Amino acid sequence: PTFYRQELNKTIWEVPERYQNLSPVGSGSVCAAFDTKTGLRVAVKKLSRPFQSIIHAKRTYRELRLLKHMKHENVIGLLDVFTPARSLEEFNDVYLVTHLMGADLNNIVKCQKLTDDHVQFLIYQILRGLKYIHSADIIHRDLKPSNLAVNEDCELKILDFVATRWYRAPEIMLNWMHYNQTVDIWSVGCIMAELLTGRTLFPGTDHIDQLKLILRLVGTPGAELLKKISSESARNYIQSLTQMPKMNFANVFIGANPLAVDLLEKMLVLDSDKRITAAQALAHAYFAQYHDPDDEPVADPYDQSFESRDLLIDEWKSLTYDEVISFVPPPL
Ligand SMILES: Cc1ccc(-n2nc(C(C)(C)C)cc2NC(=O)Nc2ccc(OCCN3CCOCC3)c3ccccc23)cc1
Ligand SMILES: Nc1ccc2c(NCc3cc(CC4CC4)co3)nc(-c3ccccc3)nc2c1
């Protein structure tokens, strides 16, 4: 494949001839383009200094390994990955190609009002994607409206591109080091609550103000949850806050679907051991119009053994180069 060059907002791009009409989108740096081989509008992300440090190199390998493995309708997939290099000695740029979506859920929630029917379809697609992601032993940790891309037909894709702490599970705020996958479910509840009211549910100014807003809704942790908190520092700070009662969500999300209020009651739970999972939430009556267990697939098992390895930069670079060369595009 022959490459061409052009500068687009300080960053120079070397892309194959198949990608035309490059247009800057945001900032790695992303460009919108047209793929003459497939006829699709695509998004091309150029990784910025992929091997500047051990942190960058392993991060580069992690993202390429993740995107190559994601093959689900509601999760961002990899259409192509290329580099202008002809060998490992000159391998310094990595480009990632995916579908071009219309916008993100952040634009829709602040520019449009969503019917309860639209909330069902949008939240169902998130939970459908989360079940696929969680089945591969992967936690997103960064779910928020700006990480969810939506088309004009309300088709949604999860990606990992508005404060993140507003959607962070409380066990992440207190820096618990043994949380589970339901930290994403807490984020879904905060997102679902925002689609129903148009307001951010927990607009905290800091980590402490975030927990104060959370406790005003969910109430004081009970004796069962207090038994399972290992940090004496956090366990004492929780016992230092005045006893807040748990608000009834029907009095908070008024005029909302009774099934929507019940699902939020199962998602916005402090005790992560009792928080509803992605698979269980798909079976909730709120998604009866869309739920189909035979069309909610799980993922092929994903090898994360590299995360426990301590390698050099050129070793991470060489491993990334192998994944670039071994990539097989999906058929049309
Ligand atoms: C270190 C690291 C590790 C993993 C990730 N990671 N994790 C995920 C999962 C969890 C959802 C599978 C996905 C990602 N990576 C991404 O979501 N990467 C991307 C974000 C935004 C983009 O372009 C946004 C612009 N948008 C594209 C499509 O919609 C229209 C415009 C991208 C464009 C092309 C290629 C990748 C993009 C990210 C970083
Ligand atoms: N088995 C479980 C189940 C839930 C746990 C958990 N849940 C999240 C949480 C929420 C809160 C409420 C704080 C706002 C006051 C405290 O912890 N935190 C923590 C935790 C929090 C801080 C430090 C160490 C552990 N451990 C949990 C163990």
Side-chain angles (χ1 to χ4, degrees):
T2 175
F3 284 66
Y4 72 95
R5 261 144 96 117
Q6 62 169 308
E7 167 183 35
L8 298 169
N9 184 35
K10 171 64 212 312
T11 160
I12 298 177
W13 296 69
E14 311 196 42
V15 295
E17 208 82 46
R18 56 181 287 181
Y19 304 112
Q20 299 287 293
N21 312 328
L22 275 293
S23 182
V25 172
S27 296
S29 181
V30 181
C31 265
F34 176 76
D35 187 3
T36 57
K37 185 184 295 294
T38 69
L40 302 176
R41 304 195 67 186
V42 297
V44 185
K45 186 164 90 93
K46 178 184 183 182
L47 298 185
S48 52
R49 280 119 54 168
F51 317 101
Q52 186 71 68
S53 60
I54 297 186
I55 293 296
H56 280 212
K58 185 170 184 177
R59 170 188 303 160
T60 295
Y61 181 74
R62 173 185 297 111
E63 172 169 36
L64 180 54
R65 284 284 309 278
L66 269 161
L67 292 177
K68 286 182 59 183
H69 187 78
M70 297 295 99
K71 299 175 180 300
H72 189 274
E73 304 173 14
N74 300 117
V75 185
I76 181 181
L78 208 59
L79 296 176
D80 188 15
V81 48
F82 61 86
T83 177
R86 293 159 292 174
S87 52
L88 181 58
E89 65 195 17
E90 58 180 20
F91 175 54
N92 208 20
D93 290 323
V94 187
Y95 296 78
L96 304 175
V97 186
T98 190
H99 289 272
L100 188 63
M101 308 289 297
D104 57 352
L105 197 59
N106 184 25
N107 293 327
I108 305 179
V109 67
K110 289 310 297 162
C111 299
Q112 300 173 13
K113 185 57 183 182
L114 299 169
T115 325
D116 183 74
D117 191 6
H118 293 101
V119 178
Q120 297 177 24
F121 187 50
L122 289 173
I123 299 302
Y124 172 80
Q125 293 177 89
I126 302 175
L127 295 171
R128 188 170 179 264
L130 276 188
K131 172 187 177 180
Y132 177 88
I133 291 177
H134 292 171
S135 73
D137 199 73
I138 301 163
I139 305 184
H140 194 282
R141 303 179 192 86
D142 198 7
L143 267 186
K144 52 183 177 182
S146 60
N147 280 335
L148 301 164
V150 185
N151 278 338
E152 285 186 24
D153 54 3
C154 299
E155 288 171 353
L156 178 143
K157 276 180 176 293
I158 301 178
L159 51 88
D160 203 333
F161 203 2
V162 277
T164 297
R165 63 181 177 274
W166 297 345
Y167 311 90
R168 279 276 177 85
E171 55 268 23
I172 308 291
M173 298 271 87
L174 285 185
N175 292 262
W176 186 28
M177 222 170 185
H178 297 102
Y179 56 95
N180 59 31
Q181 298 172 328
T182 62
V183 296
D184 295 331
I185 298 298
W186 177 278
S187 303
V188 174
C190 298
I191 293 176
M192 173 173 170
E194 185 174 334
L195 305 187
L196 294 174
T197 67
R199 303 180 173 99
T200 304
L201 182 58
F202 300 132
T205 59
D206 53 74
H207 283 207
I208 299 307
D209 187 60
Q210 186 76 21
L211 300 179
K212 272 139 180 53
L213 298 181
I214 290 174
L215 283 202
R216 197 165 66 93
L217 182 76
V218 302
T220 313
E224 183 187 57
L225 176 56
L226 225 53
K227 289 156 58 74
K228 304 192 291 186
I229 295 165
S230 57
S231 174
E232 181 206 277
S233 180
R235 191 175 59 256
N236 283 332
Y237 173 72
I238 292 161
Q239 293 174 103
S240 68
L241 296 170
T242 178
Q243 290 254 339
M244 296 290 300
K246 172 185 176 300
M247 281 200 286
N248 188 257
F249 289 13
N251 294 123
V252 176
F253 313 98
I254 53 87
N257 191 322
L259 296 172
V261 180
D262 180 79
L263 180 66
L264 288 169
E265 287 274 13
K266 294 175 170 57
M267 290 179 161
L268 304 176
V269 170
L270 285 182
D271 198 336
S272 60
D273 292 330
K274 304 256 71 183
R275 195 175 301 153
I276 192 170
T277 67
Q280 298 165 343
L282 287 170
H284 195 272
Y286 185 62
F287 309 108
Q289 195 83 339
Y290 306 91
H291 175 58
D292 181 19
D294 301 322
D295 200 6
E296 294 157 357
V298 296
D300 300 322
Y302 178 57
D303 187 6
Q304 291 189 72
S305 62
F306 70 93
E307 296 284 359
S308 298
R309 307 213 167 90
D310 170 54
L311 310 174
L312 298 172
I313 287 178
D314 289 325
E315 288 174 324
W316 290 117
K317 167 185 289 184
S318 180
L319 288 175
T320 300
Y321 189 75
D322 297 338
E323 296 294 338
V324 171
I325 300 303
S326 65
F327 176 82
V328 177
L332 299 101

